[PDB]
Amino acid sequence: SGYLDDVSAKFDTGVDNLQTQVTEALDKLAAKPSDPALLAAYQSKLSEYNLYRNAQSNTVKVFKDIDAAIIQISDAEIWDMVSQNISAIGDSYLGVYENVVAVYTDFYQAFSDILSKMGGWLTVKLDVTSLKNDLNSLVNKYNQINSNTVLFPAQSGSGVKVATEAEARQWLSELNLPNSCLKSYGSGYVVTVDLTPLQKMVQDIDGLGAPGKDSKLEMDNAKYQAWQSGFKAQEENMKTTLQTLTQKYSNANSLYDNLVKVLSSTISSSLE
């Protein structure tokens, strides 16, 4: 509607420009595959690319509300109306991340609670059978599809909300999670927490050997230290995963804010 048309172009151009920067960033990374910073730059670009496409696909809904709000002018005021009239985008981007981190945190806490009773299960003798029972139970619980396991889509209330495969795969790639996290359900797909560390744990407990009468298992210090270390390392992986999702969320907040600045500056210039 008049000045909105300009804003629509800005998204198109932005989407085009980003599509190119995602490629440029992927190349730079290819040349130095193990660089932490190059990987994040590439991924930020992808996240940003997905964000503009998101906005692009919500053009109709968003422009409608913004136009209304407009039909009633400070730059700060423009920025504010844009800020409260783009939930279509906000809820499907930041809302998702908010949910990803909330769910992964609860998942990690559930694990922490299990660690709490390790001493109670301890050459050395470890209550192998009972520790593995809690781990295996944790796995089966978080290996289901419900509001305690799903990262994307956000599960709003009672029932199970799914997405198309491409949508879920896009979030799978943005969160950089393994394929084991992608699950089918009903008409679509969902992204759930990574259980690989837990499964590796119970798996390694099995490698300690069959227990005895106590159903427990005693082992010399060498064998125990190596087990305790491999175990702690798996816990660290889950901790690392939680932290990377948190950092991606924080990065997303900044990309979202920048998009709002662009959107606002355009609308402003268009009204002049």
Short mmCIF file of C-alpha atoms in Angstrom, two decimals:
data_model
loop_
_atom_site.label_atom_id
_atom_site.label_comp_id
_atom_site.label_asym_id
_atom_site.label_seq_id
_atom_site.Cartn_x
_atom_site.Cartn_y
_atom_site.Cartn_z
CA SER A 1 0.00 0.00 0.00
CA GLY A 2 1.92 2.99 -1.35
CA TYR A 3 5.04 3.24 0.81
CA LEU A 4 4.82 -0.42 1.82
CA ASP A 5 5.84 -1.42 -1.70
CA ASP A 6 9.29 0.05 -1.00
CA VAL A 7 9.58 -2.00 2.16
CA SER A 8 8.67 -5.13 0.22
CA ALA A 9 11.55 -4.47 -2.19
CA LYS A 10 14.00 -4.06 0.70
CA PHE A 11 13.18 -7.60 1.85
CA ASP A 12 13.59 -8.96 -1.67
CA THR A 13 16.94 -7.22 -2.10
CA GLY A 14 17.95 -8.24 1.40
CA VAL A 15 17.01 -11.84 0.74
CA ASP A 16 18.99 -11.68 -2.51
CA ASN A 17 22.01 -10.04 -0.86
CA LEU A 18 22.06 -12.54 2.03
CA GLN A 19 21.65 -15.54 -0.25
CA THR A 20 24.97 -14.36 -1.73
CA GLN A 21 26.69 -13.68 1.61
CA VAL A 22 25.71 -17.17 2.80
CA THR A 23 27.60 -18.56 -0.19
CA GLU A 24 30.58 -16.25 0.30
CA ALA A 25 30.72 -17.27 3.97
CA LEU A 26 30.43 -20.98 3.20
CA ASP A 27 33.37 -20.66 0.82
CA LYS A 28 35.61 -18.85 3.34
CA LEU A 29 34.85 -21.66 5.80
CA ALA A 30 35.62 -24.36 3.23
CA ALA A 31 39.18 -23.02 2.98
CA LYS A 32 39.64 -23.29 6.77
CA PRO A 33 37.01 -25.93 7.84
CA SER A 34 38.01 -26.13 11.48
CA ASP A 35 37.89 -22.41 12.31
CA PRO A 36 35.36 -21.59 15.10
CA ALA A 37 34.75 -18.05 13.89
CA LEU A 38 34.34 -18.91 10.22
CA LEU A 39 31.76 -21.52 11.09
CA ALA A 40 29.75 -19.06 13.21
CA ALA A 41 29.90 -16.34 10.57
CA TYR A 42 28.50 -18.78 7.97
CA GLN A 43 25.77 -19.89 10.36
CA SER A 44 24.85 -16.40 11.41
CA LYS A 45 24.39 -15.59 7.71
CA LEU A 46 22.20 -18.65 7.24
CA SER A 47 20.14 -17.74 10.29
CA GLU A 48 19.87 -14.20 8.91
CA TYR A 49 18.99 -15.52 5.47
CA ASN A 50 16.22 -17.66 6.97
CA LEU A 51 15.04 -14.61 8.91
CA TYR A 52 14.57 -12.38 5.88
CA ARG A 53 12.83 -15.18 4.01
CA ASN A 54 10.62 -15.53 7.08
CA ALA A 55 9.74 -11.83 6.91
CA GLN A 56 9.34 -12.14 3.16
CA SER A 57 6.73 -14.88 3.56
CA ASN A 58 4.83 -12.89 6.19
CA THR A 59 4.71 -9.74 4.10
CA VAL A 60 0.93 -9.68 3.72
CA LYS A 61 0.03 -10.19 7.37
CA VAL A 62 2.69 -7.81 8.65
CA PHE A 63 2.20 -4.98 6.14
CA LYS A 64 -1.52 -5.02 6.88
CA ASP A 65 -1.08 -4.41 10.61
CA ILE A 66 1.74 -1.93 10.15
CA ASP A 67 -0.28 0.06 7.60
CA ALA A 68 -3.22 0.22 9.99
CA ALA A 69 -0.96 1.40 12.81
CA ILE A 70 0.56 3.91 10.38
CA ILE A 71 -2.84 5.36 9.48
CA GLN A 72 -2.76 7.34 12.73
CA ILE A 73 5.36 10.85 12.64
CA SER A 74 8.50 10.24 14.73
CA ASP A 75 11.16 7.72 13.69
CA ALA A 76 11.13 6.26 17.20
CA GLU A 77 7.36 6.04 16.82
CA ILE A 78 7.73 4.22 13.50
CA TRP A 79 10.19 1.81 15.11
CA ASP A 80 7.77 1.16 17.96
CA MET A 81 4.77 0.36 15.76
CA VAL A 82 6.92 -1.98 13.68
CA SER A 83 8.12 -3.63 16.92
CA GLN A 84 4.62 -4.58 18.08
CA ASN A 85 3.24 -5.49 14.64
CA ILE A 86 5.56 -8.32 13.49
CA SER A 87 4.75 -11.24 15.82
CA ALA A 88 4.29 -13.43 12.74
CA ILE A 89 8.05 -13.14 12.28
CA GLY A 90 8.99 -12.77 15.95
CA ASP A 91 7.07 -15.83 17.14
CA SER A 92 8.42 -18.02 14.32
CA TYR A 93 12.03 -16.95 14.91
CA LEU A 94 12.80 -15.65 18.40
CA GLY A 95 9.79 -17.55 19.77
CA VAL A 96 11.28 -20.79 18.44
CA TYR A 97 14.72 -20.06 19.95
CA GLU A 98 13.11 -19.14 23.28
CA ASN A 99 11.43 -22.56 23.21
CA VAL A 100 14.56 -24.36 22.04
CA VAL A 101 16.54 -23.09 25.02
CA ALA A 102 13.71 -23.52 27.57
CA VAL A 103 13.21 -27.16 26.57
CA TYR A 104 16.92 -28.01 26.35
CA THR A 105 17.48 -26.46 29.79
CA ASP A 106 14.75 -28.58 31.35
CA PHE A 107 16.21 -31.60 29.59
CA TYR A 108 19.66 -30.86 30.97
CA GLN A 109 18.31 -30.24 34.46
CA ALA A 110 16.60 -33.63 34.45
CA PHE A 111 20.05 -35.11 33.85
CA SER A 112 21.65 -33.04 36.59
CA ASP A 113 19.13 -34.49 39.02
CA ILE A 114 20.40 -37.97 38.12
CA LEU A 115 24.02 -36.95 38.76
CA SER A 116 22.95 -35.90 42.24
CA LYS A 117 22.82 -39.52 43.40
CA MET A 118 26.13 -40.77 42.01
CA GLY A 119 27.87 -41.09 45.35
CA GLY A 120 24.95 -43.22 46.46
CA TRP A 121 26.06 -45.69 43.79
CA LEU A 122 29.70 -45.91 44.85
CA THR A 123 39.56 -50.41 43.61
CA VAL A 124 35.96 -49.19 43.51
CA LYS A 125 32.44 -50.63 43.32
CA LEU A 126 29.80 -48.80 41.26
CA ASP A 127 26.08 -49.54 41.28
CA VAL A 128 26.18 -50.08 37.53
CA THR A 129 22.68 -51.56 37.21
CA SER A 130 20.89 -48.70 39.00
CA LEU A 131 22.77 -45.82 37.34
CA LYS A 132 22.12 -47.32 33.90
CA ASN A 133 18.46 -47.71 34.87
CA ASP A 134 18.02 -43.99 35.46
CA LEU A 135 19.92 -43.10 32.30
CA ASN A 136 17.89 -45.53 30.22
CA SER A 137 14.70 -44.17 31.75
CA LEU A 138 15.82 -40.60 31.00
CA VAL A 139 16.45 -41.62 27.40
CA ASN A 140 13.05 -43.26 26.92
CA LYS A 141 11.33 -40.23 28.37
CA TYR A 142 13.09 -37.67 26.21
CA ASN A 143 12.98 -40.00 23.25
CA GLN A 144 9.25 -39.38 22.95
CA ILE A 145 7.40 -36.56 21.22
CA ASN A 146 5.74 -34.16 23.64
CA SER A 147 6.16 -30.75 25.27
CA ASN A 148 9.22 -31.94 27.16
CA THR A 149 11.14 -33.16 24.11
CA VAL A 150 10.28 -30.93 21.16
CA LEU A 151 12.52 -27.99 20.28
CA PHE A 152 10.70 -27.05 17.05
CA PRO A 153 7.87 -26.30 16.47
CA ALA A 154 7.03 -24.79 19.84
CA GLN A 155 4.28 -26.93 21.39
CA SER A 156 1.51 -24.48 22.25
CA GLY A 157 -0.68 -26.21 24.81
CA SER A 158 -2.39 -29.59 24.60
CA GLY A 159 -1.61 -31.74 21.57
CA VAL A 160 1.31 -32.11 19.17
CA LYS A 161 2.25 -29.45 16.60
CA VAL A 162 4.43 -30.57 13.73
CA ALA A 163 5.98 -28.97 10.67
CA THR A 164 6.78 -29.90 7.10
CA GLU A 165 10.05 -31.80 6.60
CA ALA A 166 11.81 -28.85 4.93
CA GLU A 167 10.82 -26.55 7.78
CA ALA A 168 12.04 -28.93 10.44
CA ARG A 169 15.20 -29.65 8.42
CA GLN A 170 15.89 -25.94 8.14
CA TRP A 171 15.74 -25.60 11.94
CA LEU A 172 17.78 -28.76 12.24
CA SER A 173 20.51 -27.10 10.15
CA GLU A 174 20.21 -23.75 11.90
CA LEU A 175 20.52 -25.34 15.34
CA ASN A 176 23.24 -27.57 13.91
CA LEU A 177 21.74 -30.67 15.53
CA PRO A 178 22.26 -34.27 14.39
CA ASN A 179 19.80 -36.16 12.20
CA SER A 180 18.75 -38.19 15.20
CA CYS A 181 16.99 -35.04 16.40
CA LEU A 182 14.69 -34.94 13.35
CA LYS A 183 11.55 -37.01 13.97
CA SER A 184 8.35 -37.73 12.03
CA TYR A 185 4.90 -37.58 13.60
CA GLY A 186 1.43 -37.45 12.11
CA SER A 187 1.49 -35.31 8.98
CA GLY A 188 4.93 -33.84 9.54
CA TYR A 189 8.19 -33.49 11.43
CA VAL A 190 9.63 -32.09 14.64
CA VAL A 191 13.12 -31.39 16.05
CA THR A 192 13.85 -32.93 19.48
CA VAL A 193 16.73 -32.90 21.96
CA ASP A 194 19.94 -34.79 21.15
CA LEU A 195 20.11 -38.01 23.19
CA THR A 196 23.45 -39.14 21.76
CA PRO A 197 25.45 -38.33 24.90
CA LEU A 198 23.09 -40.25 27.24
CA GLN A 199 22.98 -43.26 24.95
CA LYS A 200 26.78 -43.20 24.77
CA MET A 201 26.84 -43.21 28.58
CA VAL A 202 24.65 -46.28 29.22
CA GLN A 203 26.52 -47.77 26.29
CA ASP A 204 29.87 -47.28 28.03
CA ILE A 205 28.48 -48.60 31.30
CA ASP A 206 27.79 -51.81 29.36
CA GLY A 207 31.45 -51.90 28.39
CA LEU A 208 32.46 -52.02 32.06
CA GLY A 209 31.21 -55.61 32.13
CA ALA A 210 28.38 -57.64 33.64
CA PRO A 211 27.77 -56.89 37.35
CA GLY A 212 27.70 -59.46 40.15
CA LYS A 213 25.47 -60.39 43.07
CA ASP A 214 25.07 -56.82 44.28
CA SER A 215 24.14 -56.45 40.61
CA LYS A 216 26.87 -53.86 41.08
CA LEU A 217 30.41 -53.93 39.75
CA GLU A 218 33.75 -53.42 41.43
CA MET A 219 36.77 -52.38 39.37
CA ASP A 220 40.33 -51.20 40.03
CA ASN A 221 41.08 -47.47 40.05
CA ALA A 222 42.52 -47.42 36.51
CA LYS A 223 39.37 -48.86 34.93
CA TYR A 224 37.22 -46.58 37.07
CA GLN A 225 39.09 -43.36 36.27
CA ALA A 226 38.81 -44.03 32.55
CA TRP A 227 35.08 -44.67 32.96
CA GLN A 228 34.49 -41.63 35.16
CA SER A 229 36.30 -39.48 32.59
CA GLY A 230 34.45 -40.81 29.56
CA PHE A 231 31.26 -40.24 31.54
CA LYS A 232 32.07 -36.67 32.53
CA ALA A 233 33.01 -35.94 28.93
CA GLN A 234 29.52 -36.96 27.78
CA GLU A 235 27.94 -34.72 30.37
CA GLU A 236 30.15 -31.90 29.07
CA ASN A 237 28.85 -32.47 25.54
CA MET A 238 25.28 -31.90 26.64
CA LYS A 239 26.44 -28.82 28.53
CA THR A 240 28.23 -27.63 25.38
CA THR A 241 25.11 -28.22 23.29
CA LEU A 242 22.99 -26.21 25.69
CA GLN A 243 25.54 -23.37 25.50
CA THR A 244 25.72 -23.28 21.68
CA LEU A 245 21.92 -23.09 21.39
CA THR A 246 22.01 -20.27 23.92
CA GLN A 247 24.65 -18.44 21.86
CA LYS A 248 22.67 -18.96 18.62
CA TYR A 249 19.60 -17.50 20.39
CA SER A 250 21.59 -14.46 21.53
CA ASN A 251 22.89 -14.04 17.99
CA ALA A 252 19.32 -14.37 16.67
CA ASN A 253 18.19 -11.54 18.98
CA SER A 254 20.75 -9.25 17.40
CA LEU A 255 19.83 -10.27 13.83
CA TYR A 256 16.15 -9.75 14.64
CA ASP A 257 16.85 -6.28 16.07
CA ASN A 258 18.85 -5.34 12.97
CA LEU A 259 15.96 -6.44 10.72
CA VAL A 260 13.61 -4.20 12.71
CA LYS A 261 16.03 -1.29 12.23
CA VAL A 262 16.09 -1.86 8.48
CA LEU A 263 12.32 -2.26 8.28
CA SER A 264 11.89 0.96 10.29
CA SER A 265 14.43 3.02 8.31
CA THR A 266 12.77 2.01 5.08
CA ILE A 267 9.24 2.85 6.18
CA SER A 268 10.65 6.16 7.41
CA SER A 269 12.46 7.07 4.18
CA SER A 270 9.37 5.89 2.28
CA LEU A 271 7.31 8.38 4.28
CA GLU A 272 9.59 11.11 2.98
#
